[PDB]
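Hi L.,

As promised, arg-ala-cys-arg-phe-phe-cys:
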Amino acid sequence: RACRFFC
């Protein structure tokens, strides 16, 4: 997974 949105 490439994040929810902001990491």
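DSSP finds no helices and no strands in the chain.

Thanks again for sending the construct details.

K.
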